[PDB]
Every structure is written in structure tokens, then in C-alpha cells.
């Protein structure tokens, strides 16, 4: 019976005004009674506003609040605390997706509250890797640079990484608005029973690109199948902390409880490392690697780990991460972590966005691990495979082609090389150039790539299986 | 610096400060801060030296109503070349440029071995012109200024790739390079150049580029003075 | 009240505080000196003195102010100097004679003997008056002809009584609100805490650009009017050029200039030409300074004083802004910004994250930076201003590693990076086409759809041709030009003349120190229709040396384009550029044959 | 141990370096598949001089 909540209880909660001291971000109390280690609680300024905050130590009757918001104005004679006695909860329903949510869970749509069917605690348990299973059908994107050639699996963990300027939260826009599942049926994907999610999360993110991602998912239709978590820069740093977080418990919920397929973009993890980064400096830990705390390997991979498809329930969830590089290296934190932790990797290059070309998404360094599953004979079409061996083939004999293009003259390269640069020049220009709002399934991008590919001559488009290249490419 | 201030801005006097071994000054900081326990900044130096080291460099420059000045020339040894290190890191936000000497230039047996492409001045822009020095000055010295980048970075390849593979850019680069270096900035320990004749010597320098590829001087100033040999 | 407890530097404790809240201005000894409370122990509080701390004896009285470092807001605001804490410099040294700043000098920061004309606005006794609404009008300068006197926001009641139009100091009461049995007096001035952004009715999208004058970022890189912006701080760059043409020529009805972290000598600078410098698109030739209060802050000011010298500038922005005006905000160095934080965050015993930076750098640029939007004002009449933040950067090394400039990146739509290899061959302005973006070339389509529909696409093709030479000229300095197609040629030798003739920008020339917009995009069409026809004529068979010799006279004519005088107006000039584009093809299909 | 530029260790410099044995390396393979090109050629025209 789902009459078992026993929610109906009354918690009477303390509010103390014995603080003790102010420093920085956080407010020491002095005689809190029991004090929870991770409760959340309120505090009363003396002009009347309120500011949330978050227990972050826990010592005999000493309890140290980390305040959303700073702490400017607070007094150690008049201000009072509201301790709430539970973490940071989050209320969720089946009708969270269109709303729009701040990066602390309230809706800032305009919209009415959550009317939560249950109170789904933040930062939820690991799953259980017995009950774990492997991916085992392609989540669709729009975009041929990563549908045929870096194909996404229902449970695969991706990242796209990006640098600062370079045209990531667009794409992330693009996949918000485009993703899906692939192969046809009798029935649509915006059913009750094979039904698809997203939930997008931006941390740090800037207030006209979070006004662009706004406008964006109400505009096209989208956010009724998004629940968007947006988080400012100038906003609290808790919050973006808690951000992915409330993602991922939202994204749990529908997966594992509702049973839909949800993709999960976790936009500028940067910008959320640069708040955990912060925050570990909050609670005086001396900084790690590059500055940043040692543990976050065990922080990020608890946020990415909140994903992947289960055995008893037909939900699944799909994590594209969006970071940015720093300074354009692998070798960073952040980077590094979640190449550890994810399957594959995006590239978006800043040499393909000068160009012009969008999306700059360079295929050669980017990578899907487990791009096998996604793709087959009942998996989007037989040739998904070895046309996106042929594509990486014949990109990378383009791109050494087009460096002895300078080199050795143009009519010194081989014929194989003559129709690798203009090989190159159709691919970069017109597959992997789409526009922001070109919509291309996967079928779509795979015949245009067979376009691509129907220059080639038979005897050196040797990636190919001879059946598939026999069927496909004579005519 | 309270003595110079005393005779420039009280006794009208025009005071040149010369402060040797900042770096001295900054170690003595540090030491004071490590006995402390303060929180140390980059390489242990506290993190008020910027404080400090502009609380003494911005005791210079002149006032509205009193005639005199205060010119500051202070000198840090950079401990290991490095102009990256937290002393003249620090000096150079304060100061309005530098002057850099460089271990090559003393290996080479240039005195003075004045580094022009780190050596700076911040305010050399407004003290050059038609009525003060000579209406050539800014273009030549940028001109002097890029076409020694370039004989570095020709030189940079040429170790590398050879002379021959240079282009004739790169082979006028390394002769003017080695005329500069070997002649205008090679001096006398006594040897008082005024800054026309330093200029008329910049101009004999330049004057091994062709005209046209002298890009970084104005017209007018390039046919005024170029054909003045 | 409170007493001294403890100094080192200019971190105080003062003890018998109970009372004190955080960021609370106090009265430090007995010369009053201005401080902020910076952390609470209980009855000791910390503070952080504004000026200097020597002399301070254990048990001197500590008065706490009750109010956070606020700055006042109203007329005699515009052509005036500042510090960090807004005290008025100009006035400091009339009332003190002395070329020094006297210690706890409590000078107004708004002149109080200044009448001025009050026109009073649409509400009258009994109207209900919210937070930002215009009460009255004030004539401060011939430039700034209507300043609007705003009712202080977080603060509302029925109007009771309305001064008539005449001529007030800024003391004399104005208008007297009832709230709900509390009654308030408002004067011409109003005071509002730095830390604390001014509120808005709704932030809307930056989407008018603002018009630098230097080519390559109003045509590769532009920023729109509200947008945030990177600059690097080495002179000769925008970092001394892009501040006088956005104060001298942009469409900004106010610019606040913020010289935190300055050089002794630099501040010197921008006191003698600010006022000497002068504006022509008013209609009449007026000094900028009509436009622009400074916040002068050099280096040897004390540590808090940096701090707060940026935040004191974006609160006179914000109150621009809220007067329906777009109003340019010029940071000299918001590294100096970070390095004073540093320094406080040191002081003040904290966990420092990267290098010694403290850990919320980030949060800090971030709750500066995001305070300029375009927005729409408090309170009535409905109006729209915005805040251009424009600010610099020194670098660290001469890289991006500095972890100012990477937490920077992350919140500035705009950069405008620095390129240490065109700076050293004094290639001027000296932008890293390669690293430096803008993200509102996507906002700016519609501008551009507008007035100039090309504008996107060369652009685009210029990015690509830059792109693709750069790449082509890192293979040559191994390899050589001796292979290369005669098309690599052009490539290279298109990419040349632009980074020549178009990026390169005088800033100190009358012909080019302001290149107007439309004169960039038809500077545009010239070099993107001399590489299009060059490619379309070396498709044709024709040897490349050939053609560039016959066609010397046009390539000098694309190069020359630079030196038409703005001046001489949109008219002449865009038609003088369609006859350069017409003998280009005419040439072209000459020497074609 | 081993060849040493003698450069000033700093992140700005450790990032010029990196970008440096990059383009050196780039340049390796480039001159090295050049060479292939200029010997498949020379083969060719030592047969042609051997006939």
C-alpha cells in the first residue's frame, strides 16, 4: 500500500539566538541541543529576511551552520536559527518535468510548489552494482557527430568536454532538445509505458546563458520533458553544490520508480568543482592537487555513478557531464576525474569552432567506450558500426592528408589523398557542421554519411564489412 | 624614501632614489613573517609584501604645487633569473615598467646587458614626442623593439632549422640582431650617449631593412628620416 | 561603545562589540577611522581599517556605525573623484590643503552646498511611491540634463508631502513618505550598501552592441551594451586605448571607471585627461567627465580600500542604471581585485585554494560580474538601463594559469585575450584572435539582421580564414612556402593583410582611433571580396604570382581602406567603399583574361 | 640526467614547453612522412638511372 508515509506527524522545531560567532561563510552556535551533522535549517536575520544554511560541524552542543548567501548582516545578539531536524530533502512527483527549479529545489518558474508524492532524501544511497546492468540500446542526441559516430548507450556515463567560450552550453541546449530513443514503434516515446526524460542541471551557470537555456526548453517543446535545475554563478555556492544533486535524486525518482529513460546533462562540472573546492576550504582542509581537495574523485564519481540501467526496473538513466577545460588540458583535475569515471568523452575543439564550424565537436580525440551496445541490427541499423569506422578512417587519412597538403603539394599525395581532403572538407562542413536547431535522427545521419562515404572506391574502403559495403555502397 | 620626500616635496629638490637589493628588503620581510607564524604567500614571502613593496615604490613621482620630484630606480636581484618570482612579480604591478638585465647579454660581454623585450617603461609613451626628444622616438623604438623579437625568433629557428632555411626576414632579423646587440646596446661604462644620438644610431641600425618592410614607423616619420643617412 | 582589543596591520579586534553585525561600519580610535567588521567572536569583533593603522593604542573607543560600507547616491555624483570608500578627493583637498589625505577626514562624498534644480516628478500627497520610482527630476550637468532622483529602494509609503520645483541642497528635505505610522524624510542623496547588488524589476537579454571603436573586437569579438568583458591589463592594448574610446565614443549615457590596484603615476594619467577629453555625439563638444565619476584607489591605499573600490564603482553603475541610462563600468584591474582578497583572506587566517587565492574567488568575480546585465528599473515609470562591465586583467606569467583569469573565464561572455606575439612586435590592439570569444555573437544576429545582414557570415569567414592560415603558417616555419597551392598562398597572404590593415588598429591616428561600425563591416566586405575573388581567379588557372603583381594597386587600395576618416560620414564613406569594391571586381575580371 | 634546456620551472613556462615537444613532435611525423614521400621518389629515379 502506498498509505505508509506517516508524514502526518508534527516536528515542533528549535530556534536558537545563541550564536556564538560569525566567520566567513559560516555561523558557529554555542548551546544547539542534538544537532544533526547535515541538517538544514533557517536563519532569521535581524532585518527580518530569512537565509537558509546548512550544518557542516557538529561538536558537544557546538553546531557550525555553512549559510547560503554569505553571511553579511548577521549579529551574534539578535539573529535566530531554525533547526529543521532533516537534510536537505527535496520533494518530488511524476509532474516535476516543465517546472523549472532553482539550484536549492524551489521552483522558479512562477509556478505553484512541488506537491511532492514523497520527500525523496538528497544524495541517495549508491545502487547496488549486483542489481546494475549493462547498456544495451543507443539514446538518441540529434547531432551526427555523436549519433554515428560516438553513440551514446542507454546507461553510459559521457562527458563532453569543452574550454571557456567554446559553444557547450548550446550543444548541451541542442541535446536537451533533440534526445530521445531510436527506433520506431507502433507507439510514441511520449506515452505512459516506454516513456523518455530529461533533466538538465546547469551549475555556475551564467544568468544570460541560463535565460538562453530558459527560453530555449519553454520555447520548443522541451521542458515537458525536462526538469531544469538552474543555478547562477552569483548564487549561493551550497546551492551549486546540491544542484547536481537534485538532478540526480529527480532523475533516480523518474527512472527507477516512474520507469522512463531519462538523460541527465550535468552542464559546467567545473563550475561545480570550483564550488566544492570552496567549500572544502570552507571547513579549513588544506587544498589537494592544483588547489583542489584530494577526495573529489569519490565526490564526482558519486555523482556520476547515479546513473546506468537496473535489472528490475525498465528505467535508465543516461549522464552527458558538460565540463570545461582550464587552460585546454586533459592533465587537469577535473578532466582527468571524470575520464576515470566516465565511459568515453565528447570533444568540442576550439580549432573546429574558429572555423565555424558547429557543432566544433572534434571526433578524433573524442571517444564512446561502450558505443558497441548502442548500436545493431535491432539497434539503429546494421551498418552503424563500421560506417562510424569508416567515417573515423577516412577523417583521420584527411586530416594527415590535408597536413601534407602543405608539405608535399597537393598533387604529390596519393588518390586516396586527393579524395580525403574533399572527403574532410564535405564531412567537417556539412555532417558534423549542423545547425543549433537541425534535427537529424540517427537514420538521417547515417545515410549522410553514407553520402559522404559514396565517393570512396570499393577496394580502400577497407573498414567496412564486405556485406555491409557490397549492400550499402553499390547504391 | 621620508628623506627623499623631505628634500623633493618640502625643500624642492629633484631626488633619484636608488633602493639596491629589494630582493634583501623582501628576504628580511619574509623572515619577519615566518618568525610570525603569519600565513605565507607564494615562495613563504607574506602575503602583504605587494602592500609593503608599494607603500615604498609609490613614494615617488611629482605634486601640484611643489617643483621638485622623486625619481625611484630601486634594484632586486631576481633570485634565480626568474622575473616570475614573487619579488619582481610583485615590483613589476607597482612600478611603471623595468629594467631587465639578463644573464645572456653579461655572457656575451655586453654591458650593459639591458634586455629590451622583458625591460619596460610605463610611461615612456608621453615623455617622447615632437617638443620632448624627437618626433621619430616612439616609431623607431617600437620598430627597434619588433625587429629584435624577430631576430630572437629567427634565431629560435635557425638553431633549429638553419640559416638557409630561413627566409631573407629571418637573415636581415639575425644581422640586425647582432649589429644591435654588438653596437647600440653595448656601451661604455663612461660612455654618455645623448638620446639624439642614440636615436641617429637606431636609425643607422634600421637602416639595413629595405623601407618598405619597416611597417612599424608612420610614413612621414619613415621618409623623413630614413633617406637621412 | 566597543574598545580596541588587539591591531596587526589593519586588522583590529575590538572587544565589548555584542552588538556589531558583519560588514558593519565602525568608527576605529579616536581619529574615527572607517572600518568593517569582518568576523564576530562574540564580544570581540574583527575589523578591517579603511585607512591607515599605525598609532592605534589598546582601548581606544570603537563606535559602531549600525550601517554596512554604503555609498551615496544622487546629484553632484557625476564629475567627481573617488577612492574606494567614496571620499572625495578634489573636495578633500580644498577642505585639507594639504597634498596629503588627512587620516579619518570625513569629508561628504556629495557635495552639500550644491543647490540644485529640482523638478518634481508625476507623484503627488497621498500617492502610494515604491522602491525606484521617480519622485522628481534634478539639471546636474549639460550632459546629464534630467537626473532622476530615485525614492531608495527597500523602502515605500504614501507620499505626504512633495517639495515644489526649486533649488534644494542635498541635505534639504525632498519628500516625506507614510508608511504604516512610521513617517520617513528623503533628501536628493540616498545611501546603499556596496556589497548588495540594487534590485531590478527583471533582467532582461543584452542585446544592443557597444560600439568599442576598435576593429577587431567590435567585428570578431563584439560585446553588447550590459554584457561583461575581459580586457588584459598591458598598456598600449585596450588596456589604455579601449577605455578612452568606450568613454569618448560608445553609447553610454555614464562611465564609471574603477582604478583599483592603480600605479601612482597611472592615476596621474587618467586625472589629466579625463578632463580634457570631449564629446562630439551629444551634439555639442562636452568633456566626458559630464559622463563619468572615477574611483581612483592606487596602489599604497590600504588592502580593503582595493576591495572595495570595485564594489563601490558597480553600486554607481547599478544607480545609473536604475535612472533608465546605459552606463559603462571600466575595472583597471579586477587582478588587483583578486590579489587585495588574497591579501584580506591572508590576514584573516583562511584556507587559501589555489597559489594563496582565496577559495571564493570565483563567487566574488562572480557576484561582481553578474551585477550587469541590461535590466529593467525598480519601481515607475517603467524604463530600461544596463551595466557594460568592462574589465581588465593583468596577467600572471604572461598565461592564463593565474587562477584570476580562470575563474574570470568562466562568468564573462566576453574576452578579449592577449597576444604576447603581436604585444612584442607592437601589433596594436593586439588580441589573440585564437583564444579570445565572445557569446554574444549569437545575441548580436538580430542587431545585425537589422543593419548590417553580412556582418555574421564575414565574420565567420574571416575567423576561418585567420583559422586557417595560422595553422598553415605553423606548418610553413618547418616545412616552408615552397610547397603550398597557390590557394594556401592566398590563404596566407589574405590573413596577412588582414591581421595588417584590419585587426591592427592606431587607437593615437584621427583616421582610425574610433572605426565606426559601419566602416568596419564594409572593411569586412573589402578583405573578404579580395580573398573570394583571389580563390575565384586562382580556381581559374591563374598563377598566384602573376595576379598578386597585376593587382597590387587593389591590395593597396583594401589596405588603404583603414585610412578613411569617419568623419567625413556613413554616406560618403559607404560609397567610397563601394567604388573600391567595384574596381576590385573590375580589376579582377581584367586580370582574369 | 640527460639533456636539459635550463629553463625557468613555471606553469607558464611547463605550458610552453608542452606546446613546444608538440610541435616538434608534429614536425617529426611531418618531415618523417616527407622524407617517405622525397625516398619513394628517389627509389623511382635510381631505377630510372640504373635502366
Request: charge should be negative.
Amino acid at each position: 500500500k502506498k498509505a505508509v508515509e506517516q508524514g502526518f506527524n508534527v516536528k515542533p522545531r528549535l530556534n536558537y539566538n545563541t550564536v556564538s560567532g560569525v566567520n566567513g561563510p559560516l555561523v558557529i552556535l554555542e548551546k544547539v541541543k542534538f544537532p544533526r551533522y547535515n541538517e538544514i535549517v533557517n536563519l532569521t536575520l535581524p532585518d527580518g529576511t530569512v537565509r537558509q544554511g546548512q550544518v557542516l560541524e557538529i561538536r558537544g552542543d557546538r553546531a557550525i551552520v555553512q549559510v547560503f548567501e554569505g553571511t553579511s548582516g548577521i549579529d551574534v545578539k539578535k539573529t535566530t536559527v531554525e533547526f529543521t531536524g532533516e537534510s536537505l530533502r527535496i520533494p518530488v512527483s511524476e509532474d516535476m518535468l516543465g517546472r523549472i527549479f532553482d539550484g536549492s529545489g524551489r521552483p522558479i518558474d512562477n509556478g505553484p510548489k512541488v506537491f511532492a508524492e514523497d520527500y525523496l532524501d538528497i544524495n541517495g544511497s549508491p545502487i547496488n552494482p549486483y542489481a546494475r546492468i549493462y547498456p544495451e540500446e543507443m539514446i538518441s542526441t540529434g547531432v551526427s557527430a555523436i549519433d554515428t559516430m560516438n553513440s551514446i548507450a542507454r546507461g553510459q556515463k559521457i562527458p563532453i568536454f569543452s574550454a571557456s567560450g567554446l559553444p557547450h552550453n548550446e550543444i548541451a541546449a541542442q541535446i536537451c532538445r533533440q534526445a530521445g530513443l531510436v527506433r520506431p514503434t507502433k507507439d510514441v516515446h511520449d506515452g505512459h509505458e516506454e516513456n523518455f526524460s530529461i533533466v538538465f542541471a546547469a551549475m555556475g551557470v551564467n544568468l544570460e546563458t541560463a535565460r538562453f537555456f530558459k527560453q530555449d526548453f519553454e520555447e520548443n517543446g522541451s521542458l515537458e520533458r525536462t526538469s531544469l535545475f538552474l543555478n547562477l554563478a552569483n548564487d549561493p555556492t551550497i546551492e551549486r553544490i546540491i544542484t547536481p544533486r537534485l538532478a540526480l535524486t529527480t532523475a533516480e525518482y523518474l527512472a527507477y520508480q516512474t520507469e522512463r529513460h531519462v538523460l541527465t546533462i550535468l552542464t559546467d562540472m567545473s563550475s561545480y568543482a570550483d564550488a566544492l573546492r570552496e567549500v572544502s576550504a570552507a571547513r579549513e582542509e588544506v587544498p589537494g592537487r592544483r588547489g583542489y581537495p584530494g577526495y573529489m574523485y569519490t565526490d564526482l564519481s558519486t555523482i556520476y555513478e547515479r546513473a546506468g540501467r537496473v535489472e528490475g526496473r525498465n528505467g535508465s538513466i543516461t549522464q552527458i557531464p558538460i565540463l570545461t577545460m582550464p587552460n585546454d588540458d586533459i592533465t587537469h583535475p577535473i578532466p582527468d576525474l571524470t575520464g576515470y569515471i566516465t565511459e568515453g568523452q565528447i570533444f568540442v575543439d576550439r580549432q573546429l569552432h574558429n572555423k565555424g564550424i558547429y557543432p566544433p565537436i572534434n571526433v578524433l580525440p573524442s571517444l564512446s567506450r561502450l558505443m558497441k551496445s548502442a548500436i545493431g541490427e535491432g539497434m539503429t541499423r546494421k551498418d552503424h558500426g563500421d560506417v562510424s569506422n569508416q567515417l573515423y578512417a577516412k577523417y583521420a587519412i584527411g586530416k594527415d592528408a590535408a597536413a601534407m597538403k602543405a608539405v608535399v603539394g597537393e598533387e604529390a599525395l596519393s588518390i586516396e589523398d586527393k579524395l580525403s581532403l574533399e572527403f574532410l572538407e564535405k564531412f567537417e562542413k556539412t555532417f558534423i557542421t549542423q545547425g543549433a536547431y537541425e534535427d537529424r535522427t540517427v537514420f538521417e545521419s547515417l545515410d549522410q554519411a553514407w553520402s559522404l562515404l559514396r565517393i570512396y572506391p570499393k577496394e580502400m574502403l577497407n573498414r567496412i564489412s564486405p556485406k555491409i559495403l557490397d549492400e550499402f555502397y553499390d547504391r | 624614501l621620508t628623506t627623499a620626500e623631505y628634500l623633493a616635496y618640502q625643500t624642492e629638490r629633484h631626488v633619484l632614489t636608488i633602493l639596491t637589493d629589494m630582493s634583501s628588503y623582501a628576504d628580511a620581510l619574509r623572515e619577519v613573517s615566518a618568525a610570525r607564524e603569519e600565513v605565507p604567500g607564494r615562495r613563504g614571502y607574506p602575503g602583504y609584501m605587494y602592500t609593503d613593496l608599494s607603500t615604498i615604490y609609490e613614494r615617488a613621482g611629482r605634486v601640484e604645487g611643489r617643483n621638485g620630484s622623486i625619481t625611484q630606480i630601486p634594484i632586486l636581484t631576481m633570485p634565480n633569473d626568474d622575473i616570475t618570482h614573487p619579488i619582481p612579480d610583485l615590483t613589476g604591478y607597482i612600478t611603471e615598467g623595468q629594467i631587465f638585465v639578463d644573464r645572456q647579454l653579461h655572457n656575451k660581454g655586453i654591458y650593459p646587458p639591458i634586455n629590451v623585450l622583458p625591460s619596460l617603461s610605463r610611461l615612456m609613451k608621453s615623455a617622447i614626442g615632437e617638443g620632448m626628444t624627437r618626433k621619430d622616438h616612439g616609431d623607431v623604438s617600437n620598430q627597434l623593439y619588433a625587429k629584435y623579437a624577430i631576430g630572437k625568433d629567427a634565431a629560435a629557428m635557425k638553431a633549429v632549422v638553419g640559416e638557409e632555411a630561413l627566409s631573407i626576414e629571418d637573415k636581415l632579423s639575425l644581422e640586425f640582431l647582432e649589429k644591435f646587440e654588438k653596437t647600440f646596446i653595448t656601451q661604455g661604462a663612461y660612455e654618455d650617449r645623448t638620446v639624439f644620438e642614440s636615436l641617429d644610431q637606431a636609425w643607422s641600425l634600421l637602416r639595413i631593412y629595405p623601407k618598405e618592410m619597416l611597417n612599424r614607423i608612420s610614413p612621414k616619420i619613415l621618409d623623413e628620416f630614413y633617406d637621412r643617412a | 561603545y566597543g574598545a580596541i582589543y588587539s591591531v596587526s596591520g589593519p586588522v583590529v579586534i575590538a572587544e565589548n562589540m555584542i552588538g556589531c553585525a558583519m560588514y558593519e561600519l565602525v568608527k576605529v580610535g579616536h581619529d574615527n577611522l572607517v572600518g568593517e567588521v569582518i568576523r564576530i567572536d562574540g564580544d570581540k569583533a574583527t575589523i578591517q581599517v579603511y585607512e591607515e593603522t599605525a598609532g592605534l593604542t589598546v582601548g581606544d573607543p570603537v563606535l559602531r556605525t549600525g550601517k554596512p560600507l554604503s555609498v551615496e547616491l544622487g546629484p553632484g555624483l557625476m564629475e567627481t573623484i573617488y577612492d574606494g570608500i567614496q571620499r572625495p578627493l578634489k573636495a578633500i583637498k580644498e577642505e585639507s590643503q594639504s597634498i596629503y589625505i588627512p587620516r579619518g577626514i570625513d569629508t561628504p562624498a556629495l557635495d552639500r552646498t550644491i543647490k540644485w534644480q529640482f523638478t518634481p516628478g508625476k507623484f503627488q500627497v497621498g500617492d502610494h511611491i515604491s522602491g525606484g520610482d521617480i519622485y522628481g527630476s534634478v539639471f546636474e550637468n549639460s550632459l546629464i540634463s534630467s537626473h532622476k532622483i530615485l525614492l531608495p529602494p527597500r523602502s515605500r509609503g504614501t507620499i505626504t508631502w512633495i517639495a515644489p520645483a526649486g533649488e534644494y541642497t542635498l541635505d534639504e528635505k525632498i519628500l516625506e513618505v507614510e508608511f504604516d505610522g512610521k513617517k520617513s524624510d528623503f533628501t536628493l542623496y540616498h545611501t546603499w550598501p556596496v556589497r548588495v547588488p540594487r534590485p531590478v524589476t527583471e533582467k532582461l537579454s543584452a542585446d544592443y552592441p557597444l560600439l568599442t571603436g576598435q576593429r577587431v573586437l567590435d567585428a570578431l569579438f563584439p560585446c553588447v551594451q550590459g554584457g561583461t568583458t575581459c580586457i588584459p591589463g598591458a598598456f598600449g592594448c585596450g588596456k589604455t586605448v579601449i577605455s578612452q574610446s568606450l568613454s569618448k565614443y560608445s553609447n553610454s549615457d555614464a562611465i564609471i571607471y574603477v582604478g583599483c590596484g592603480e600605479r601612482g603615476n597611472e592615476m596621474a594619467e587618467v586625472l589629466m585627461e579625463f578632463p580634457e577629453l570631449y564629446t562630439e555625439m551629444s551634439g555639442t563638444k562636452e568633456p566626458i567627465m559630464k559622463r563619468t565619476t572615477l574611483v581612483a584607489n592606487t596602489s599604497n591605499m590600504p588592502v580593503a580600500a582595493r576591495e572595495a573600490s570595485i564594489y563601490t564603482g558597480i553600486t554607481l553603475a547599478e544607480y545609473f542604471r536604475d535612472q533608465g541610462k546605459n552606463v559603462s563600468m571600466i575595472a583597471d584591474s579586477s587582478s588587483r581585485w583578486a590579489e587585495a582578497l588574497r591579501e584580506i583572506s591572508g590576514r584573516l587566517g583562511e584556507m587559501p585554494a589555489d597559489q594563496g587565492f582565496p577559495a571564493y574567488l570565483g563567487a566574488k568575480l562572480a557576484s561582481f560580474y553578474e551585477r550587469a546585465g541590461k535590466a529593467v528599473a525598480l519601481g515607475s515609470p517603467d524604463r530600461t538601463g544596463s551595466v557594460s562591465i568592462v574589465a581588465a586583467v593583468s596577467p600572471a606569467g604572461g598565461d592564463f594559469s593565474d587562477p584570476v583569469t580562470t575563474a574570470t573565464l568562466g562568468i564573462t561572455q566576453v574576452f578579449w585575450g592577449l597576444d604576447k606575439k603581436l604585444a612584442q612586435r607592437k601589433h596594436f590592439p593586439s588580441i589573440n584572435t585564437s583564444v579570445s570569444y565572445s557569446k554574444y555573437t549569437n545575441v548580436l544576429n538580430k542587431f545585425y539582421d537589422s543593419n548590417y545582414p553580412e556582418f555574421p557570415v564575414l565574420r565567420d569567414r574571416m575567423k576561418e580564414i585567420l583559422s586557417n592560415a595560422e595553422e598553415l603558417e605553423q606548418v610553413v616555419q618547418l616545412v616552408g612556402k615552397s610547397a603550398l597551392s597557390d590557394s594556401d598562398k592566398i590563404t596566407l597572404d589574405v590573413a596577412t593583410l588582414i591581421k595588417e590593415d584590419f585587426l591592427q588598429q592606431n587607437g593615437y591616428s584621427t583616421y582610425d582611433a574610433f572605426c565606426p561600425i559601419w566602416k568596419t563591416f564594409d572593411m569586412m566586405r573589402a578583405f573578404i571580396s579580395y580573398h573570394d575573388e583571389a580563390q575565384k581567379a586562382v580556381a581559374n588557372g591563374a598563377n598566384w604570382s602573376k595576379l598578386a603583381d597585376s593587382t597590387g594597386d587593389v591590395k593597396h587600395a583594401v589596405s588603404s581602406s583603414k585610412f578613411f576618416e569617419p568623419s567625413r560620414g556613413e554616406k560618403e564613406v559607404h560609397g567610397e567603399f563601394e567604388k573600391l569594391l567595384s574596381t576590385m571586381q573590375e580589376r579582377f575580371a581584367e586580370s582574369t583574361d | 640526467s640527460g639533456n636539459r634546456e635550463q629553463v625557468f620551472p613555471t606553469r607558464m613556462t611547463l605550458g610552453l614547453m608542452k606546446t613546444k615537444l608538440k610541435g616538434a613532435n608534429q614536425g617529426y611525423s611531418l618531415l618523417k612522412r616527407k622524407s617517405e614521400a622525397l625516398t619513394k621518389r628517389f627509389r623511382d629515379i635510381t631505377k630510372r638511372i640504373d635502366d
